[PDB]
Amino acid sequence: MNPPPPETSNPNKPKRQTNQLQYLLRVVLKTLWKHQFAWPFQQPVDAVKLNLPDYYKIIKTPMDMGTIKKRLENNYYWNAQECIQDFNTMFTNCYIYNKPGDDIVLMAEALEKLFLQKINELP
Ligand SMILES: Cc1ccc(N(C)C(=O)c2ccc3c(c2)N(C2CC2)[C@H](C)C(=O)N3C)cc1
């Protein structure tokens, strides 16, 4: 079974649209989104489709770029650090569940290097 996806809307939450959060959506996420290796990370891991019933027994804080994109489009975050933390959870989950040298890890490593290049300087 797949768990419910992470929440992307929360009215009880203080929201903000800072210059950096706009940049994280308009330039950072949407550059990463078009990368040739982005597709595994554009939605939650479908453990049912992959027949990996073990994935959510190991990864207890799932995150993906589809969730992040929705959060940004809902002004879910208070600051850019919260959004950057979600990206880093996504990469770290991949490094936890898989092993160095695995194909999915090469993909995440390529995406993470681009991510770090783009957030090195924020508005
Ligand atoms: C090289 C590769 C890439 C994509 C897939 N396909 C079809 C996925 O749907 C998929 C999406 C996301 C992940 C994964 C598969 N893998 C599994 C491959 C170990 C683990 C759970 C993971 O960490 N992520 C992020 C299969 C192989």
Side-chain angles (χ1 to χ4, degrees), residues 1-16 18-35 37-48 50-80 82-98 100-123:
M1 213 168 318
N2 291 324
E7 93 174 346
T8 57
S9 82
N10 192 331
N12 282 348
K13 207 163 177 300
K15 298 185 161 38
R16 234 166 33 150
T18 62
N19 285 338
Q20 299 190 339
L21 279 163
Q22 292 182 306
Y23 180 91
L24 278 174
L25 179 58
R26 183 182 59 88
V27 6
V28 174
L29 183 148
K30 296 193 164 175
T31 298
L32 264 42
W33 192 274
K34 295 174 174 66
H35 193 281
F37 293 158
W39 58 271
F41 306 94
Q42 282 172 346
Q43 59 286 309
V45 169
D46 189 338
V48 173
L50 297 162
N51 295 286
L52 300 172
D54 55 314
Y55 180 80
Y56 291 108
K57 299 199 172 296
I58 296 163
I59 295 304
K60 302 300 189 188
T61 309
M63 187 54 55
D64 65 281
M65 293 206 291
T67 294
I68 292 166
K69 175 173 157 150
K70 288 188 213 289
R71 285 180 172 190
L72 287 165
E73 296 173 355
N74 289 345
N75 298 297
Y76 182 92
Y77 300 109
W78 183 259
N79 61 33
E82 289 183 337
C83 173
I84 288 158
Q85 188 163 41
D86 279 350
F87 276 99
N88 277 323
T89 295
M90 178 186 76
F91 294 125
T92 295
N93 290 343
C94 184
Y95 306 144
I96 291 170
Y97 176 75
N98 306 281
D102 288 352
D103 284 355
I104 189 72
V105 171
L106 300 175
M107 294 172 91
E109 286 167 352
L111 281 176
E112 183 184 15
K113 282 193 203 186
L114 181 60
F115 173 72
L116 290 171
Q117 182 181 339
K118 302 175 63 56
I119 66 161
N120 179 90
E121 182 177 48
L122 303 176

PDB file of all heavy atoms in Angstrom, residues 6-7 9 18 31 37-38 41-43 46-47 49 61-62 69 71-73 87 90 96-97 104 108 115-116 118 123, unseen atoms left out:
ATOM      1  N   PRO A   6       2.359  13.556   1.226  1.00  0.00           N
ATOM      2  CA  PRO A   6       2.544  14.674   2.152  1.00  0.00           C
ATOM      3  C   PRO A   6       1.529  15.767   1.868  1.00  0.00           C
ATOM      4  O   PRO A   6       1.057  15.937   0.742  1.00  0.00           O
ATOM      5  CB  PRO A   6       3.979  15.145   1.860  1.00  0.00           C
ATOM      6  CG  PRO A   6       4.630  13.970   1.204  1.00  0.00           C
ATOM      7  CD  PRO A   6       3.564  13.320   0.407  1.00  0.00           C
ATOM      8  N   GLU A   7       1.177  16.516   2.904  1.00  0.00           N
ATOM      9  CA  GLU A   7       0.174  17.549   2.717  1.00  0.00           C
ATOM     10  C   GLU A   7       0.738  18.655   1.840  1.00  0.00           C
ATOM     11  O   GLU A   7       1.932  18.977   1.900  1.00  0.00           O
ATOM     12  CB  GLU A   7      -0.300  18.094   4.066  1.00  0.00           C
ATOM     13  CG  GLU A   7       0.420  19.313   4.592  1.00  0.00           C
ATOM     14  CD  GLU A   7      -0.224  19.849   5.866  1.00  0.00           C
ATOM     15  OE1 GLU A   7      -1.359  19.437   6.188  1.00  0.00           O
ATOM     16  OE2 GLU A   7       0.417  20.678   6.544  1.00  0.00           O
ATOM     17  N   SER A   9      -1.615  21.463   1.267  1.00  0.00           N
ATOM     18  CA  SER A   9      -2.378  22.643   1.645  1.00  0.00           C
ATOM     19  C   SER A   9      -2.686  22.589   3.132  1.00  0.00           C
ATOM     20  O   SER A   9      -3.011  21.529   3.667  1.00  0.00           O
ATOM     21  CB  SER A   9      -3.675  22.759   0.834  1.00  0.00           C
ATOM     22  OG  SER A   9      -4.694  21.938   1.374  1.00  0.00           O
ATOM     23  N   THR A  18       7.914  35.239  -0.267  1.00  0.00           N
ATOM     24  CA  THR A  18       9.128  36.034  -0.274  1.00  0.00           C
ATOM     25  C   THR A  18       9.747  36.012  -1.665  1.00  0.00           C
ATOM     26  O   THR A  18       9.398  35.184  -2.509  1.00  0.00           O
ATOM     27  CB  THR A  18      10.125  35.505   0.757  1.00  0.00           C
ATOM     28  OG1 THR A  18      10.500  34.167   0.410  1.00  0.00           O
ATOM     29  CG2 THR A  18       9.487  35.476   2.132  1.00  0.00           C
ATOM     30  N   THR A  31      13.628  24.732 -13.387  1.00  0.00           N
ATOM     31  CA  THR A  31      14.808  24.229 -14.087  1.00  0.00           C
ATOM     32  C   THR A  31      15.019  22.750 -13.790  1.00  0.00           C
ATOM     33  O   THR A  31      15.208  21.939 -14.708  1.00  0.00           O
ATOM     34  CB  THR A  31      16.055  25.026 -13.698  1.00  0.00           C
ATOM     35  OG1 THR A  31      15.894  26.398 -14.076  1.00  0.00           O
ATOM     36  CG2 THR A  31      17.295  24.460 -14.397  1.00  0.00           C
ATOM     37  N   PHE A  37      16.765  13.769 -15.876  1.00  0.00           N
ATOM     38  CA  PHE A  37      16.662  12.820 -14.774  1.00  0.00           C
ATOM     39  C   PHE A  37      15.606  13.202 -13.737  1.00  0.00           C
ATOM     40  O   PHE A  37      15.564  12.580 -12.672  1.00  0.00           O
ATOM     41  CB  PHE A  37      18.017  12.666 -14.076  1.00  0.00           C
ATOM     42  CG  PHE A  37      19.089  12.017 -14.923  1.00  0.00           C
ATOM     43  CD1 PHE A  37      20.431  12.216 -14.616  1.00  0.00           C
ATOM     44  CD2 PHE A  37      18.766  11.194 -15.996  1.00  0.00           C
ATOM     45  CE1 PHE A  37      21.427  11.632 -15.366  1.00  0.00           C
ATOM     46  CE2 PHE A  37      19.774  10.606 -16.759  1.00  0.00           C
ATOM     47  CZ  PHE A  37      21.102  10.827 -16.436  1.00  0.00           C
ATOM     48  N   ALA A  38      14.753  14.189 -14.023  1.00  0.00           N
ATOM     49  CA  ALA A  38      13.792  14.673 -13.029  1.00  0.00           C
ATOM     50  C   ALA A  38      12.631  13.712 -12.815  1.00  0.00           C
ATOM     51  O   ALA A  38      12.028  13.712 -11.734  1.00  0.00           O
ATOM     52  CB  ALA A  38      13.238  16.034 -13.447  1.00  0.00           C
ATOM     53  N   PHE A  41      11.360  11.854  -9.694  1.00  0.00           N
ATOM     54  CA  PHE A  41      11.180  12.706  -8.532  1.00  0.00           C
ATOM     55  C   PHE A  41      10.029  13.689  -8.703  1.00  0.00           C
ATOM     56  O   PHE A  41       9.829  14.548  -7.839  1.00  0.00           O
ATOM     57  CB  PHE A  41      12.492  13.439  -8.246  1.00  0.00           C
ATOM     58  CG  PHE A  41      13.663  12.519  -8.106  1.00  0.00           C
ATOM     59  CD1 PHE A  41      14.476  12.228  -9.198  1.00  0.00           C
ATOM     60  CD2 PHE A  41      13.933  11.894  -6.899  1.00  0.00           C
ATOM     61  CE1 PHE A  41      15.551  11.349  -9.078  1.00  0.00           C
ATOM     62  CE2 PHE A  41      15.004  11.024  -6.770  1.00  0.00           C
ATOM     63  CZ  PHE A  41      15.816  10.740  -7.867  1.00  0.00           C
ATOM     64  N   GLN A  42       9.231  13.556  -9.768  1.00  0.00           N
ATOM     65  CA  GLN A  42       8.139  14.486 -10.036  1.00  0.00           C
ATOM     66  C   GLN A  42       6.847  14.142  -9.308  1.00  0.00           C
ATOM     67  O   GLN A  42       5.882  14.912  -9.390  1.00  0.00           O
ATOM     68  CB  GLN A  42       7.885  14.563 -11.537  1.00  0.00           C
ATOM     69  CG  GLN A  42       8.909  15.431 -12.247  1.00  0.00           C
ATOM     70  CD  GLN A  42       8.800  15.369 -13.749  1.00  0.00           C
ATOM     71  OE1 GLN A  42       8.136  14.495 -14.301  1.00  0.00           O
ATOM     72  NE2 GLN A  42       9.469  16.293 -14.427  1.00  0.00           N
ATOM     73  N   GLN A  43       6.808  13.018  -8.603  1.00  0.00           N
ATOM     74  CA  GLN A  43       5.634  12.596  -7.853  1.00  0.00           C
ATOM     75  C   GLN A  43       6.108  11.671  -6.744  1.00  0.00           C
ATOM     76  O   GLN A  43       7.256  11.207  -6.763  1.00  0.00           O
ATOM     77  CB  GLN A  43       4.612  11.895  -8.762  1.00  0.00           C
ATOM     78  CG  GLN A  43       5.173  10.663  -9.458  1.00  0.00           C
ATOM     79  CD  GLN A  43       6.139  11.009 -10.587  1.00  0.00           C
ATOM     80  OE1 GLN A  43       5.814  11.811 -11.457  1.00  0.00           O
ATOM     81  NE2 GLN A  43       7.321  10.403 -10.574  1.00  0.00           N
ATOM     82  N   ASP A  46       5.792   5.583  -6.067  1.00  0.00           N
ATOM     83  CA  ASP A  46       4.645   4.668  -6.161  1.00  0.00           C
ATOM     84  C   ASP A  46       5.138   3.265  -5.839  1.00  0.00           C
ATOM     85  O   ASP A  46       5.561   2.512  -6.718  1.00  0.00           O
ATOM     86  CB  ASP A  46       3.996   4.753  -7.539  1.00  0.00           C
ATOM     87  CG  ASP A  46       2.667   4.001  -7.626  1.00  0.00           C
ATOM     88  OD1 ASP A  46       2.432   3.089  -6.807  1.00  0.00           O
ATOM     89  OD2 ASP A  46       1.861   4.334  -8.519  1.00  0.00           O
ATOM     90  N   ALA A  47       5.101   2.920  -4.549  1.00  0.00           N
ATOM     91  CA  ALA A  47       5.652   1.646  -4.115  1.00  0.00           C
ATOM     92  C   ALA A  47       4.804   0.488  -4.607  1.00  0.00           C
ATOM     93  O   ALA A  47       5.318  -0.622  -4.778  1.00  0.00           O
ATOM     94  CB  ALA A  47       5.769   1.608  -2.591  1.00  0.00           C
ATOM     95  N   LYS A  49       3.218   0.394  -7.683  1.00  0.00           N
ATOM     96  CA  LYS A  49       3.609   0.178  -9.077  1.00  0.00           C
ATOM     97  C   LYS A  49       4.982  -0.468  -9.171  1.00  0.00           C
ATOM     98  O   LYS A  49       5.215  -1.352 -10.010  1.00  0.00           O
ATOM     99  CB  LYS A  49       3.597   1.509  -9.832  1.00  0.00           C
ATOM    100  CG  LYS A  49       4.094   1.415 -11.273  1.00  0.00           C
ATOM    101  N   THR A  61       9.689   9.877   6.118  1.00  0.00           N
ATOM    102  CA  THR A  61       9.425  11.275   5.789  1.00  0.00           C
ATOM    103  C   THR A  61       9.550  11.435   4.277  1.00  0.00           C
ATOM    104  O   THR A  61      10.509  12.051   3.794  1.00  0.00           O
ATOM    105  CB  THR A  61      10.388  12.218   6.511  1.00  0.00           C
ATOM    106  OG1 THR A  61      10.404  11.913   7.909  1.00  0.00           O
ATOM    107  CG2 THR A  61       9.969  13.675   6.326  1.00  0.00           C
ATOM    108  N   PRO A  62       8.615  10.889   3.505  1.00  0.00           N
ATOM    109  CA  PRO A  62       8.718  10.966   2.044  1.00  0.00           C
ATOM    110  C   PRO A  62       8.629  12.400   1.541  1.00  0.00           C
ATOM    111  O   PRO A  62       7.964  13.259   2.128  1.00  0.00           O
ATOM    112  CB  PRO A  62       7.525  10.141   1.548  1.00  0.00           C
ATOM    113  CG  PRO A  62       6.893   9.537   2.755  1.00  0.00           C
ATOM    114  CD  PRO A  62       7.419  10.157   3.970  1.00  0.00           C
ATOM    115  N   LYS A  69       6.419  21.358  -5.496  1.00  0.00           N
ATOM    116  CA  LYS A  69       5.820  22.286  -6.446  1.00  0.00           C
ATOM    117  C   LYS A  69       4.451  22.743  -5.963  1.00  0.00           C
ATOM    118  O   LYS A  69       4.148  23.939  -5.962  1.00  0.00           O
ATOM    119  CB  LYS A  69       5.737  21.625  -7.824  1.00  0.00           C
ATOM    120  CG  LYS A  69       5.023  22.449  -8.874  1.00  0.00           C
ATOM    121  CD  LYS A  69       5.137  21.792 -10.236  1.00  0.00           C
ATOM    122  CE  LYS A  69       4.022  22.244 -11.148  1.00  0.00           C
ATOM    123  NZ  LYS A  69       4.465  22.222 -12.566  1.00  0.00           N
ATOM    124  N   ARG A  71       3.325  22.752  -2.888  1.00  0.00           N
ATOM    125  CA  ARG A  71       3.488  23.586  -1.702  1.00  0.00           C
ATOM    126  C   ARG A  71       3.827  25.017  -2.086  1.00  0.00           C
ATOM    127  O   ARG A  71       3.233  25.971  -1.562  1.00  0.00           O
ATOM    128  CB  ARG A  71       4.564  23.004  -0.788  1.00  0.00           C
ATOM    129  CG  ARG A  71       4.079  21.777  -0.046  1.00  0.00           C
ATOM    130  CD  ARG A  71       5.142  21.174   0.868  1.00  0.00           C
ATOM    131  NE  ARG A  71       4.541  20.124   1.683  1.00  0.00           N
ATOM    132  CZ  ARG A  71       5.116  19.523   2.718  1.00  0.00           C
ATOM    133  NH1 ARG A  71       6.344  19.824   3.105  1.00  0.00           N
ATOM    134  NH2 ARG A  71       4.428  18.616   3.387  1.00  0.00           N
ATOM    135  N   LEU A  72       4.779  25.185  -3.010  1.00  0.00           N
ATOM    136  CA  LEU A  72       5.151  26.517  -3.476  1.00  0.00           C
ATOM    137  C   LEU A  72       3.964  27.226  -4.112  1.00  0.00           C
ATOM    138  O   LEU A  72       3.702  28.401  -3.829  1.00  0.00           O
ATOM    139  CB  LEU A  72       6.313  26.409  -4.461  1.00  0.00           C
ATOM    140  CG  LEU A  72       7.672  26.078  -3.841  1.00  0.00           C
ATOM    141  CD1 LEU A  72       8.671  25.622  -4.911  1.00  0.00           C
ATOM    142  CD2 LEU A  72       8.203  27.277  -3.069  1.00  0.00           C
ATOM    143  N   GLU A  73       3.224  26.526  -4.969  1.00  0.00           N
ATOM    144  CA  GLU A  73       2.059  27.131  -5.606  1.00  0.00           C
ATOM    145  C   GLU A  73       0.951  27.476  -4.612  1.00  0.00           C
ATOM    146  O   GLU A  73       0.074  28.278  -4.948  1.00  0.00           O
ATOM    147  CB  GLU A  73       1.533  26.204  -6.706  1.00  0.00           C
ATOM    148  CG  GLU A  73       2.505  25.986  -7.872  1.00  0.00           C
ATOM    149  CD  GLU A  73       2.027  24.922  -8.856  1.00  0.00           C
ATOM    150  OE1 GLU A  73       0.984  24.290  -8.595  1.00  0.00           O
ATOM    151  OE2 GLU A  73       2.696  24.718  -9.891  1.00  0.00           O
ATOM    152  N   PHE A  87      13.587  19.821  -0.361  1.00  0.00           N
ATOM    153  CA  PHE A  87      14.472  19.289  -1.396  1.00  0.00           C
ATOM    154  C   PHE A  87      15.500  18.353  -0.790  1.00  0.00           C
ATOM    155  O   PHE A  87      15.761  17.267  -1.317  1.00  0.00           O
ATOM    156  CB  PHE A  87      15.194  20.413  -2.139  1.00  0.00           C
ATOM    157  CG  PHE A  87      14.403  21.015  -3.265  1.00  0.00           C
ATOM    158  CD1 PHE A  87      13.718  22.212  -3.081  1.00  0.00           C
ATOM    159  CD2 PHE A  87      14.376  20.407  -4.515  1.00  0.00           C
ATOM    160  CE1 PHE A  87      12.991  22.780  -4.113  1.00  0.00           C
ATOM    161  CE2 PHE A  87      13.648  20.967  -5.558  1.00  0.00           C
ATOM    162  CZ  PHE A  87      12.975  22.160  -5.360  1.00  0.00           C
ATOM    163  N   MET A  90      14.128  15.042   0.142  1.00  0.00           N
ATOM    164  CA  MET A  90      13.967  14.232  -1.061  1.00  0.00           C
ATOM    165  C   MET A  90      15.274  13.552  -1.472  1.00  0.00           C
ATOM    166  O   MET A  90      15.296  12.347  -1.765  1.00  0.00           O
ATOM    167  CB  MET A  90      13.418  15.093  -2.200  1.00  0.00           C
ATOM    168  CG  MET A  90      13.253  14.334  -3.532  1.00  0.00           C
ATOM    169  SD  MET A  90      12.783  15.459  -4.861  1.00  0.00           S
ATOM    170  CE  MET A  90      14.316  16.291  -5.221  1.00  0.00           C
ATOM    171  N   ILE A  96      19.400   7.242   1.392  1.00  0.00           N
ATOM    172  CA  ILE A  96      19.143   6.260   2.444  1.00  0.00           C
ATOM    173  C   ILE A  96      18.662   4.941   1.848  1.00  0.00           C
ATOM    174  O   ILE A  96      19.235   3.878   2.113  1.00  0.00           O
ATOM    175  CB  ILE A  96      18.120   6.808   3.459  1.00  0.00           C
ATOM    176  CG1 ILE A  96      18.723   7.947   4.272  1.00  0.00           C
ATOM    177  CG2 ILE A  96      17.650   5.704   4.401  1.00  0.00           C
ATOM    178  CD1 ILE A  96      17.699   8.686   5.117  1.00  0.00           C
ATOM    179  N   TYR A  97      17.594   4.986   1.041  1.00  0.00           N
ATOM    180  CA  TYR A  97      16.950   3.746   0.601  1.00  0.00           C
ATOM    181  C   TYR A  97      17.831   2.963  -0.370  1.00  0.00           C
ATOM    182  O   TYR A  97      17.830   1.725  -0.356  1.00  0.00           O
ATOM    183  CB  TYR A  97      15.594   4.057  -0.035  1.00  0.00           C
ATOM    184  CG  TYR A  97      14.916   2.819  -0.601  1.00  0.00           C
ATOM    185  CD1 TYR A  97      14.318   1.886   0.237  1.00  0.00           C
ATOM    186  CD2 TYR A  97      14.908   2.575  -1.966  1.00  0.00           C
ATOM    187  CE1 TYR A  97      13.723   0.745  -0.274  1.00  0.00           C
ATOM    188  CE2 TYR A  97      14.313   1.446  -2.485  1.00  0.00           C
ATOM    189  CZ  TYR A  97      13.726   0.539  -1.633  1.00  0.00           C
ATOM    190  OH  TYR A  97      13.148  -0.592  -2.154  1.00  0.00           O
ATOM    191  N   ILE A 104      19.279   5.096  -9.737  1.00  0.00           N
ATOM    192  CA  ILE A 104      18.440   6.161  -9.198  1.00  0.00           C
ATOM    193  C   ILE A 104      19.285   7.142  -8.386  1.00  0.00           C
ATOM    194  O   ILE A 104      18.967   8.339  -8.320  1.00  0.00           O
ATOM    195  CB  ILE A 104      17.272   5.562  -8.388  1.00  0.00           C
ATOM    196  CG1 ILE A 104      16.273   6.653  -7.999  1.00  0.00           C
ATOM    197  CG2 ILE A 104      17.772   4.867  -7.144  1.00  0.00           C
ATOM    198  CD1 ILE A 104      15.428   7.185  -9.128  1.00  0.00           C
ATOM    199  N   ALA A 108      19.691  11.238  -8.782  1.00  0.00           N
ATOM    200  CA  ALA A 108      19.534  12.198  -7.692  1.00  0.00           C
ATOM    201  C   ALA A 108      20.779  13.055  -7.531  1.00  0.00           C
ATOM    202  O   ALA A 108      20.678  14.258  -7.262  1.00  0.00           O
ATOM    203  CB  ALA A 108      19.202  11.466  -6.388  1.00  0.00           C
ATOM    204  N   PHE A 115      20.707  21.557  -8.297  1.00  0.00           N
ATOM    205  CA  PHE A 115      20.003  22.276  -7.237  1.00  0.00           C
ATOM    206  C   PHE A 115      20.953  23.166  -6.439  1.00  0.00           C
ATOM    207  O   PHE A 115      20.662  24.346  -6.189  1.00  0.00           O
ATOM    208  CB  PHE A 115      19.296  21.256  -6.340  1.00  0.00           C
ATOM    209  CG  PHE A 115      18.668  21.842  -5.113  1.00  0.00           C
ATOM    210  CD1 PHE A 115      17.532  22.615  -5.205  1.00  0.00           C
ATOM    211  CD2 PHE A 115      19.213  21.603  -3.866  1.00  0.00           C
ATOM    212  CE1 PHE A 115      16.937  23.132  -4.073  1.00  0.00           C
ATOM    213  CE2 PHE A 115      18.635  22.130  -2.733  1.00  0.00           C
ATOM    214  CZ  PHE A 115      17.503  22.892  -2.836  1.00  0.00           C
ATOM    215  N   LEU A 116      22.102  22.621  -6.032  1.00  0.00           N
ATOM    216  CA  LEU A 116      23.052  23.397  -5.239  1.00  0.00           C
ATOM    217  C   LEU A 116      23.637  24.557  -6.037  1.00  0.00           C
ATOM    218  O   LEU A 116      23.878  25.634  -5.479  1.00  0.00           O
ATOM    219  CB  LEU A 116      24.168  22.495  -4.716  1.00  0.00           C
ATOM    220  CG  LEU A 116      23.715  21.509  -3.637  1.00  0.00           C
ATOM    221  CD1 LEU A 116      24.801  20.491  -3.313  1.00  0.00           C
ATOM    222  CD2 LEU A 116      23.294  22.287  -2.396  1.00  0.00           C
ATOM    223  N   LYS A 118      22.038  26.241  -8.296  1.00  0.00           N
ATOM    224  CA  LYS A 118      21.014  27.263  -8.470  1.00  0.00           C
ATOM    225  C   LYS A 118      20.660  27.977  -7.171  1.00  0.00           C
ATOM    226  O   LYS A 118      20.288  29.159  -7.209  1.00  0.00           O
ATOM    227  CB  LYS A 118      19.764  26.642  -9.086  1.00  0.00           C
ATOM    228  CG  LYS A 118      20.040  25.982 -10.430  1.00  0.00           C
ATOM    229  CD  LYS A 118      18.799  25.274 -10.937  1.00  0.00           C
ATOM    230  CE  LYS A 118      17.677  26.269 -11.172  1.00  0.00           C
ATOM    231  NZ  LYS A 118      18.098  27.348 -12.114  1.00  0.00           N
ATOM    232  N   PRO A 123      17.855  35.539  -4.453  1.00  0.00           N
ATOM    233  CA  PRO A 123      17.576  36.976  -4.403  1.00  0.00           C
ATOM    234  C   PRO A 123      17.544  37.468  -2.967  1.00  0.00           C
ATOM    235  O   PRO A 123      17.461  36.693  -2.012  1.00  0.00           O
ATOM    236  CB  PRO A 123      16.207  37.112  -5.076  1.00  0.00           C
ATOM    237  CG  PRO A 123      15.620  35.738  -5.060  1.00  0.00           C
ATOM    238  CD  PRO A 123      16.751  34.770  -5.053  1.00  0.00           C
TER     239      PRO A 123
END
